[PDB]
Amino acid sequence: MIQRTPKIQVYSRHPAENGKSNFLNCYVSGFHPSDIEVDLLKNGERIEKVEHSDLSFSKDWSFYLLYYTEFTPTEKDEYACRVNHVTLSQPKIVKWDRDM
């Protein structure tokens, strides 16, 4: 069957300011089929109680989801997302870079 690999972006709701509460987002889009697993990571460990949007899709039928959690960025703490999908031979980790 035809499959489409997810586009992945990891980013914050507001421009990051160290010590100020914010939201960390992982937007996965452009994928098919719809089963997908997304973790948000803090210093390499899974963040608990991450929420996500309800499955929807774009005009080309490809799916998108937003995964999100409240966070307070600091200078030292590293954040990332880890995405698995049938199209991936291994999970893909994308690091949060406050400039992207």
Binding site: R13, Y27, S53, L55, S56, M100
Partner: protein
């Protein structure tokens, strides 16, 4: 301006793991306003915008009834599709449907939509005439013959020209504080050296609604289409959207580059440069 209403539906079979999962969401423009998920403990259509919360219990009862009926129809359709494509009962498959309407700033119908996809591929679509069908393949032609015999297009047309437009009008008025407010992008340009010879200029648009936007870079007034990295417009989680466009520039040539931003919240498109 113009506006849209859309209902999106996804059914995903999972043999050996119960009945197909069904999830449906409704949007006005880029605003989610209702959702239903068959895997919720006691599934009901739920509001997702403040302006729909005033609809009474009967609204939610009718909506929930339709959601469950649509889930059931999709279960039948998924079994049928296995037959039409000579497929095993072992695999997971997906059925997607969208319908709705676009209206102009006067509230008049621009056009209606009703379309279906199987395993991520177009299957059958109602044409813009709201009277005839486009079938993607010989399987979908079987559906087309069935739906022609049943005059299904006629009922869809009546809904799309009538209730779809009327209810969209209602929602726009009830949500006039938000649905009829465009939030312009907040824009800036950042500069990141890559080497002694080149740097990235990234043009940012933040906090905008609706999501439609155009961000372009020009060099000496020429669009840099092939050399611009554009990310997909992405949701911030506070209703608004974000996007950026980047170009790699020779060091010293930064002032030859201009970022151009078009958004319906802007009275005139903006031109930005890196401001060191």
């Amino acid at each position: 301006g113009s506006h849209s209403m859309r209902y999106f539906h996804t059914s995903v079979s999972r043999p050996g793991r119960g009945e197909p999962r069904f999830i449906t969401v409704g949007y006005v423009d880029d605003t989610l306003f209702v959702r239903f998920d068959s895997d919720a403990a006691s599934p009901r259509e739920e509001p997702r915008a403040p302006w729909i919360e005033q609809e009474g219990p009967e609204y939610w009862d009718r909506e929930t009834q339709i959601c469950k009926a649509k889930a059931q129809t999709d279960r039948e359709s998924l079994r049928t599709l296995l037959r039409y494509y000579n497929q095993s009962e072992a695999g997971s498959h997906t059925l997607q449907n969208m319908y709705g309407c676009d209206v102009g700033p006067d509230g008049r119908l621009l056009r209606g939509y009703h379309q279906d996809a199987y395993d991520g591929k177009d299957y059958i679509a109602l044409n813009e005439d709201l009277s005839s069908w486009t079938a993607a393949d010989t399987a979908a032609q079987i559906t087309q013959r069935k739906w022609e015999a049943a005059r299904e297009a006629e009922q869809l047309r009546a809904y799309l020209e009538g209730e779809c437009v009327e209810w969209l009008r209602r929602y726009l008025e009830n949500g006039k504080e938000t649905l009829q407010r465009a939030d312009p992008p907040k824009t800036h340009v950042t500069h990141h050296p890559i080497s002694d010879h080149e740097a990235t200029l990234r043009c940012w648009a933040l906090g905008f609604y609706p999501g439609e936007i155009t961000l372009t870079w020009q060099r000496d007034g020429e669009d840099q289409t092939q050399d611009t990295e554009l990310v997909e417009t992405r949701p911030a989680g506070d209703r608004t959207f974000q996007k950026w466009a980047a170009v790699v520039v020779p060091s010293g040539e930064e002032q030859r580059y201009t970022c151009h931003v078009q958004h319906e919240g802007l009275p005139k498109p903006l031109t930005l440069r890196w401001e060191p």
